[PDB]
Design a protein around this nucleic acid. Structure first.
Lengths: 690, 182
RNA sequence: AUACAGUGAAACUGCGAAUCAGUUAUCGUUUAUUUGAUAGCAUGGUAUAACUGUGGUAA
RNA sequence: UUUGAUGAUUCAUAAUAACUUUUCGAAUCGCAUGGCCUUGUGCUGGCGAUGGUUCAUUCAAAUUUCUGCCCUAUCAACUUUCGAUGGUAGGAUAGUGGCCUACCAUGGUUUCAACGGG
């Protein structure tokens, strides 16, 4: 069907110049007496616009018989540029294509007009931006590429001059103008053989301090041949680009050559990049190479890549290079040589963190050696708690240097913790989890705030006397890690007598209804552990109804039925079971994250034991939303001021930003402790909803 | 006769065939939408509070009922304690998620700071090898465009008035000129 | 294009479905439509379609 | 010396008073999304798609003034039967208006070819 009505920006998106790729028999292949006269009279016939008519009435004495043109060169050129500087939109195609033709007949005598012609052209491209016509842009950029096609013989040495003339198009900060003009200039780059292109690349790199994306588009359009085929001069254009690179250019030019290599690698599929890789390897044999190597290992002879990387490492960036080589490598011998280089590669915590975020595979040898070589980075790396590589974490955590473990045991023996030595003991016990007597002693000394209590409970879960001391501390009492410690003690008689001696579990069975569902799940898993170590049908129904909490529409349609059945059982059927059922009902009605479950709770609150804890819990819920709890623990300040290897790409910028955030997480100890304090469980929330 | 019974919370529905017509004899001359108890009509189903739907007779046409309604339908208004086989246990999901912005805000309890855009329902449809995830829509959502159009309506009203009551004055200038003339 | 963004069946909504003859007035009526003028809460709730299912029914 | 006219007005229009089973004064959409700099995440801003108050226009309808057509005096009386014809009010009317109601009057048509019939 016809009639689609693409918008103006839509047509600009469809636009690409490529006039030598546009193949018709236009006028110029059929040449009369002049080369200008045929396109003159043809446009005189096909187009009517009043200033084009009076222009034709002005120049008709001198258009015909090309001696007339070569005599009357300047005067009718001034007539041309005056009418283009008049510029109604309907006269633009004839006058502009005639000015395009006005150089092809002449050749060298147009170079006394060339600069002023391009000046009128760029003024009219600004007028075209305020005109909003994709046809006008198409004609103007088409005639510009025509001028460059007809004058590429004489525009060899003056490349720097003409790009300095056309630099209001490249750095215009309106990206489709530069995306247009970069095609024409890239055709000129494809024209110019070697040395003038080298000087042009030098001046273009030097003038770089929105010109960066324009230079990227010019390089990509110079390499841009047909579909899945590279340019014929691409192997030499990469040579001129690498010669202008390698410490001959500014800082952003390295990322510019990187992004040009990225777009060229995305364009040319596989076989078109044999000679490009050969020329780039020949330019890389001499020895900035780091951003280039990471860029060429982005897009996926890896042994030759490993050999060149080993030479350039014999002589962060090396961490990102090794991470990408690990994510896309194919040789276990090269991986072992990379472990040999990882012996000399610093920041191995951040390197292993980004590598484990990338993949999870064989050759995990250097982790134990880095642990034996041995602070805050090891603290954060062990603080990566529940990963997919936890199966290797729990098996390789023993391989650390136990001298550091016994040294932390000497710091965990005595603890004079006022405000920050509790945090220092938290940082110690985090590593000491991967390392019972000192645990119970330090826990007694510590119980003699919330973050230090949660960290002590983590060492408690990592650790019947200890169970009695933990029950005494729970009678003396964040709560998520505390219930983790309690469940780890209860699952990891004498214990029956020790639990029957102390009366407990009523406080936890009452305060299981918290505003955090993970805290509710931890309390529900802890209370069943206590009732197991010292009824169970209704408790397991309440645990299973809170188990299927992934409230997708199938499971959320299922959960109202499951909660209604368990509530019918526990309402048609002890004081502790009534407290646990009331706490589960209060937690379900105070979740306020799914209105499916809050309909089942409003159904289940209709047949309860009258005013047992119902109206008391309702008054507690109404009073919970008059003020809010706050003020978690603080820390000091830290500063990375680092982690840059890229400027602007599509996905390479995202991968580099991910490695930069990884390095800023593996930054200094104050930021590491701030990230550790950020790594917490849930808390009280949902104000105004409860 | 045949009794289509539908559990509403799951929403499931299955049919039964009811012989022993003196169970059906209490349905008779009773108006549509009146209460029916579980054990009080039948044998096995206990405590199932119902209400009759009415509907189609013999050969399918529709207050006071006779024995022509072969297809009698019920929804389980209140479940008793009978463990049904495809109604109460096997749950079918509610199909279409909420579409409107404040409808989603009611469905997940959002406040006036959320600007939801992630509390949308999701779905992944499976070709078998290449998945297609989809977020449908948040309609009646406050956009940057909607208050732009509200601002444009304000600007158009104030511009029309601030041209009209001034063109009044430039007419009154010519009227004052003719009054000084005459 | 992790709200949406391409095409888009279905469905809702919107729109449209004795001839009398010449012959004046409508300061006696309405005037759908076109055309031209024209008016100083970051935005809430229903009640449902298509669809998923349970059937009857020779239909 | 204050106001827009037609041949012509209780015309067009303006002011007060309240009645409104309370009408409207945009909870709408597409393309771009540019600017001001106190960079808020602010305030602004373009083109046009629909809607909507009133008036005019345009297109219409429904009535209305004046003439006409088939043969006839083996058709001279026809209409106030259960409206015939007026005037006054009311209702109906989208309205002028027996389109109807009651009340007041007893009219009106016709040898001119009426009235009736072919």
């Amino acid at each position: 069907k016809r009639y689609r009505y693409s918008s103006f920006k839509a047509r600009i998106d469809d636009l690409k110049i490529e006039p030598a790729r546009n193949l018709e028999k236009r006028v110029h292949d059929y040449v009369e007496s002049s080369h200008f006269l045929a396109s003159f009279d043809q446009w005189k016939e096909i187009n009517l616009s009043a200033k084009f008519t009076e222009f034709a009435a002005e120049i008709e004495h001198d258009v015909q018989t090309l001696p007339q043109i070569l005599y009357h060169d300047k005067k009718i050129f001034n007539s041309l540029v005056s009418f283009i500087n008049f510029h109604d939109e309907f006269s633009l195609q004839p006058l502009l294509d005639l000015l395009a033709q006005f150089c092809h007949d002449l050749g060298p005598d147009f170079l006394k007009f060339y600069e002023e012609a391009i000046k009128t052209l760029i003024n009219l491209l600004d007028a075209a931006i305020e005109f909003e016509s994709s046809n006008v842009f198409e004609w103007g950029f088409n005639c510009l590429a025509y001028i460059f096609k007809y004058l590429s013989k004489f525009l060899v040495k003056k490349l720097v001059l003409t790009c300095d003339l056309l630099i209001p198009l490249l750095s215009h900060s309106k990206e489709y103008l530069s995306r247009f003009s970069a095609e024409a200039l890239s055709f000129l780059v494809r024209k110019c053989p070697v040395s003038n292109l080298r000087e042009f690349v030098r001046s273009v790199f030097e003038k770089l301090e929105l010109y960066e994306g324009l230079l990227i588009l010019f390089t990509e359009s110079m390499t841009s041949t047909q579909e899945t085929l590279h340019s014929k001069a691409k192997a030499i254009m990469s040579v001129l680009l690498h010669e202008a690179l390698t410490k001959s250019s500014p800082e952003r030019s390295v990322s510019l050559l990187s992004d040009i290599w990225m777009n060229i690698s995305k364009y040319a599929s596989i076989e078109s990049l044999l000679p490009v890789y050969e020329v780039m390897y020949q330019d890389f044999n001499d020895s900035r190479i780091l951003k280039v190597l990471t860029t060429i290992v982005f897009s996926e002879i890896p042994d030759w890549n490993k050999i060149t990387i080993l030479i350039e490492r014999i002589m962060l960036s090396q961490d990102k290079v090794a991470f990408l080589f690990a994510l896309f490598i194919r040789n276990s011998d090269v991986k072992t040589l990379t472990l040999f280089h990882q012996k000399l590669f610093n920041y191995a915590l951040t390197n292993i963190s980004d590598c484990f975020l990338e993949f999870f595979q064989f050759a995990l040898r250097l982790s134990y050696e880095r642990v034996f070589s041995f602070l805050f980075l090891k603290k954060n790396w062990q603080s990566q708690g529940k990963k997919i590589a936890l199966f290797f974490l729990e098996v390789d955590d023993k391989p650390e240097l136990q001298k550091v473990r016994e040294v932390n045991f000497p710091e965990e023996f005595i603890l004079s913790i006022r405000d920050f030595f509790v945090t220092a003991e938290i940082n110690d016990s985090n590593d000491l989890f991967e390392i019972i007597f000192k645990y119970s002693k330090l826990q007694n000394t510590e119980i003699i705030e919330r973050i230090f209590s949660t960290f002590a409970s983590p060492d408690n879960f990592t650790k019947g006397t200890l169970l009695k001391i933990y029950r005494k501390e729970d009678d003396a009492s964040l709560k998520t890690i505390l219930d983790n410690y309690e469940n780890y003690k209860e699952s990891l008689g004498w214990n029956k007598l020790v639990s029957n001696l102390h009366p407990s579990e009523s406080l936890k069975g009452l305060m299981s209804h918290y505003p955090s569902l993970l805290l509710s799940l931890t309390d529900n898993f802890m209370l069943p552990d206590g009732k197991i170590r010292y009824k169970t049908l209704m408790i397991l129904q309440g645990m299973q109804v809170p188990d299927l909490l992934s409230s997708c529409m199938v499971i959320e349609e299922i959960p109202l039925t499951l909660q209604n059945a368990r509530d019918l059982t526990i309402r048609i059927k002890t004081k502790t079971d009534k407290l646990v059922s009331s706490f589960f009902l209060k937690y379900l009605f105070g979740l306020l994250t799914v209105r499916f479950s809050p309909v089942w709770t409003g159904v289940f609150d209709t047949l309860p034991n009258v005013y047992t804890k119902d109206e008391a819990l309702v008054w507690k819920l109404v009073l919970s939303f008059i003020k809010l709890p706050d003020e978690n623990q603080n820390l000091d300040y830290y500063q990375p001021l680092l982690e840059d290897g890229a400027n602007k790409v599509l996905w390479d910028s995202s991968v580099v930003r991910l490695r930069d955030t990884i390095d800023t997480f593996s930054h200094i100890w104050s930021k590491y402790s701030t990230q550790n304090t950020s790594i917490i469980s849930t808390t009280i929330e949902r104000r105004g909803n409860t | 006769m045949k009794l289509n019974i539908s559990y509403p919370v799951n929403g499931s529905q299955k049919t039964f065939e009811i012989d022993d017509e003196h169970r059906i004899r209490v349905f008779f001359d009773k108006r549509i939408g009146q209460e029916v108890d579980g054990e009080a009509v039948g044998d096995e189903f206990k405590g199932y509070v119902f209400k009759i739907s009415g509907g189609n007779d013999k050969q399918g046409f529709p207050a006071i009922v006779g024995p022509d309604l072969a297809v009698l339908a019920l929804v389980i208004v209140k479940k008793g304690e009978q463990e049904l086989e495809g109604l109460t246990d096997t749950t079918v999901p509610k199909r279409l998620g909420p579409k409107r912005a404040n409808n989603i805000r009611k469905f997940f309890g959002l406040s006036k700071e959320d600007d939801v855009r992630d509390f949308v329902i999701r779905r992944e449809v499976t070709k078998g090898e290449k998945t297609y995830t989809k977020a449908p829509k948040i309609q009646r959502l406050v956009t940057p465009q909607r208050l732009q159009r509200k601002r444009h309506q304000r600007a158009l009203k104030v511009r029309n008035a601030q041209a009209q009551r001034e063109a009044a004055a430039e007419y009154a200038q010519l009227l004052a000129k003719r009054l000084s003339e005459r």
